[PDB]
């Protein structure tokens, strides 16, 4: 996250470290968030690469440990039919992963509340992005889990031309652009926290920011949105 504050070790229990193996160490590479005992949601992009992946609940800093981590490994993954690997833009970067244990809840583990499907959030709608990610455009991971205040543009003025114009679609969430805040590397598959009747619910998956650099003027970070694929998602959990 560029221009993050670090997070409270338990002010959001549902984000998860997806990491994948490499040598005989884990690495981070993506973020998630539990939305079952046994289920994670993530983007579809960040399991493209077929590797062995492993989801750490419980997470607060990566590389110490925190007392309070579960490892689990990942038994089944579910990506969405339509994404496409060449056309982030066209929407679709989501993913569930089945786990192999159902994990203890507790504090630091809770399940993600999803919105209701159709739900809309009106322009400059208060939402924080977390996760590990680059802290500056070409930088480096953040040990510690990050957030950042991050309001959401709505879909006229992220489609217009000094924007995003035809990239962004109404299957996604805008939020940013100031030029000082962002979402970045790293930080993909995680969750997009936004106030709604009192209650945070994850209503958008980070799938994507801009080439030029994380945070830039008039190019907000881009996510997917949750409530187009409620369906989705209970379909998939109802049948695995
Ligand atoms: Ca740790």
């Given at each position: 996250?560029?221009?993050?504050?670090?997070?409270?070790?338990?002010?959001?229990?549902?984000?998860?470290?997806?990491?994948?193996?490499?040598?005989?160490?884990?690495?981070?590479?993506?973020?998630?968030?539990?939305?079952?005992?046994?289920?994670?949601?993530?983007?579809?992009?960040?399991?493209?690469?077929?590797?062995?992946?492993?989801?750490?609940?419980?997470?607060?800093?990566?590389?110490?440990?925190?007392?309070?981590?579960?490892?689990?490994?990942?038994?089944?993954?579910?990506?969405?039919?339509?994404?496409?690997?060449?056309?982030?833009?066209?929407?679709?970067?989501?993913?569930?992963?089945?786990?192999?244990?159902?994990?203890?809840?507790?504090?630091?583990?809770?399940?993600?509340?999803?919105?209701?499907?159709?739900?809309?959030?009106?322009?400059?709608?208060?939402?924080?992005?977390?996760?590990?990610?680059?802290?500056?455009?070409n930088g480096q991971l953040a040990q510690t889990l990050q957030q950042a205040y991050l309001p959401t543009v709505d879909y006229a003025i992220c489609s217009?031309?000094?924007?995003?114009?035809?990239?962004?679609?109404?299957?996604?969430?805008?939020?940013?652009?100031?030029?000082?805040?962002?979402?970045?590397?790293?930080?993909?598959?995680?969750?997009?926290?936004?106030?709604?009747?009192?209650?945070?619910?994850?209503?958008?998956?980070?799938?994507?920011?801009?080439?030029?650099?994380?945070?830039?003027?008039?190019?907000?970070?881009?996510?997917?949105?949750?409530?187009?694929?409620?369906?989705?998602?209970?379909?998939?959990?109802?049948?695995?």
């Open positions: 996250v560029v221009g993050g504050t670090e997070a409270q070790r338990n002010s959001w229990p549902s984000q998860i470290s997806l990491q994948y193996r490499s040598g005989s160490s884990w690495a981070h590479t993506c973020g998630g968030t539990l939305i079952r005992q046994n289920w994670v949601m993530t983007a579809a992009h960040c399991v493209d690469r077929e590797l062995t992946f492993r989801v750490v609940v419980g997470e607060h800093n990566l590389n110490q440990n925190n007392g309070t981590e579960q490892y689990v490994g990942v038994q089944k993954i579910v990506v969405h039919p339509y994404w496409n690997t060449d056309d982030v833009a066209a929407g679709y970067d989501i993913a569930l992963l089945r786990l192999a244990q159902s994990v203890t809840l507790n504090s630091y583990v809770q399940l993600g509340v999803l919105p209701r499907a159709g739900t809309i959030l009106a322009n400059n709608s208060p939402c924080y992005i977390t996760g590990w990610g680059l802290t500056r455009t217009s031309s000094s924007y995003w114009g035809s990239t962004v679609k109404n299957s996604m969430v805008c939020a940013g652009g100031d030029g000082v805040r962002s979402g970045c590397q790293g930080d993909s598959g995680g969750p997009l926290h936004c106030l709604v009747n009192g209650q945070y619910a994850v209503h958008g998956v980070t799938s994507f920011v801009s080439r030029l650099g994380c945070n830039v003027t008039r190019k907000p970070t881009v996510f997917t949105r949750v409530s187009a694929y409620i369906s989705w998602i209970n379909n998939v959990i109802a049948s695995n």
